[PDB]
Amino acid sequence: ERHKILHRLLQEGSPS
Amino acid sequence: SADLRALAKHLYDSYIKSFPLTKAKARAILTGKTTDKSPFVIYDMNSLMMGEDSKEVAIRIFQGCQFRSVEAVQEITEYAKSIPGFVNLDLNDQVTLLKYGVHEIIYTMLASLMNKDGVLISEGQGFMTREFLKSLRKPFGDFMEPKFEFAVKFNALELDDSDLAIFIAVIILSGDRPGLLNVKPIEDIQDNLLQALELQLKLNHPESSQLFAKLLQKMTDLRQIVTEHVQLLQVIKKTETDMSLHPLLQEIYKDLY
Numbered sequence: 001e002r003h004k005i006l007h008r009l010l011q012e013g014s015p016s
Numbered sequence: 017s018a019d020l021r022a023l024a025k026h027l028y029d030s031y032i033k034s035f036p037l038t039k040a041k042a043r044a045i046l047t048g049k050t051t052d053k054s055p056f057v058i059y060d061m062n063s064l065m066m067g068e069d070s071k072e073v074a075i076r077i078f079q080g081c082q083f084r085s086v087e088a089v090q091e092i093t094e095y096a097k098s099i100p101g102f103v104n105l106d107l108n109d110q111v112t113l114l115k116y117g118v119h120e121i122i123y124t125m126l127a128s129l130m131n132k133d134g135v136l137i138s139e140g141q142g143f144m145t146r147e148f149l150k151s152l153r154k155p156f157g158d159f160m161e162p163k164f165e166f167a168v169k170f171n172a173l174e175l176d177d178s179d180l181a182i183f184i185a186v187i188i189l190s191g192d193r194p195g196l197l198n199v200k201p202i203e204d205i206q207d208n209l210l211q212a213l214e215l216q217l218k219l220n221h222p223e224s225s226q227l228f229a230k231l232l233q234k235m236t237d238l239r240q241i242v243t244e245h246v247q248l249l250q251v252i253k254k255t256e257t258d259m260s261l262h263p264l265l266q267e268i269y270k271d272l273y
């Protein structure tokens with residue numbers, strides 16, 4: 001549930 | 017058709033951007049045709065140790081592979097966002113597509129880095145032998161073998177990055193992922209992607225008949241591997257005690273058949 005990081009990948013792009 | 021060609025090009029171009037090691041580059045290294053030095057070979061424990069450019073043997077390899085599996089998910093998400101129509105989709109369906117799609121794409125692209133005797137690591141800087149990864153204890157020495165087995169089957173199709181750019185968009189845009197809310201708009205995107213793949217394969221491989229069909233058949237072989245890989249994880253649940261799983265990989269693997 002929720003998927004904090006995937007949502008955040010889809011939204012912020014990576015990392016550097 | 018010029019639409020179909022331009023979609024092929026755009027997929028190819030973002031594929032180049034998202035993925036640091038292409039099949040062309042991996043192939044040139046693997047076949048000794050490079051100039052770009054020559055990878056460090058890892059065939060055992062001591063060579064694993066000198067291969068330096070914290071805990072136990074098989075665990076170390078397991079954790080290493082985890083940093084790069086996370087990185088691969090990042091790369092694939094970047095790339096998915098580039099598929100026209102993808103970011104127009106419901107946000108939960110986007111997550112679902114990635115959740116279920118990422119393993120199938122990892123296995124597909126991992127073939128690019130493989131021959132029958134080993135695998136490129138550290139983006140081409142290393143070569144780890146099949147036999148060595150097979151020499152790990154417990155459930156660990158059984159993770160890679162079905163990948164190599166599949167890579168040998170898949171690599172005989174002789175696809176290049178152009179073909180692969182489209183194929184992996186097709187995999188991501190699967191309307192049959194569980195818990196998907198709006199199937200239709202995903203399947204309209206994939207329909208379009210299949211048409212570009214079909215034309216791409218015809219033109220790029222005019223003599224290899226029914227390649228399209230044969231590539232699509234590989235989607236049954238990709239999904240058996242996924243199935244197997246998860247059951248092996250479930251063995252690491254009980255059999256292994258303190259074994260940090262990465263949060264991103266946790267949410268990827270939480271509730272997945």
Ligand SMILES: CCCCC/C=C(\C/C=C\CCCCCCCC(=O)O)[N+](=O)[O-]
Nearest residue numbers: 077080081082084085122135136137138
């Ligand atoms: C350095 C780790 C050696 C493992 C094999 C080589 C790799 C692994 C790359 C990505 C990991 C592939 C494993 C399949 C899915 C990983 C999910 C998991 O950790 O269970 N490589 O990139 O060259």
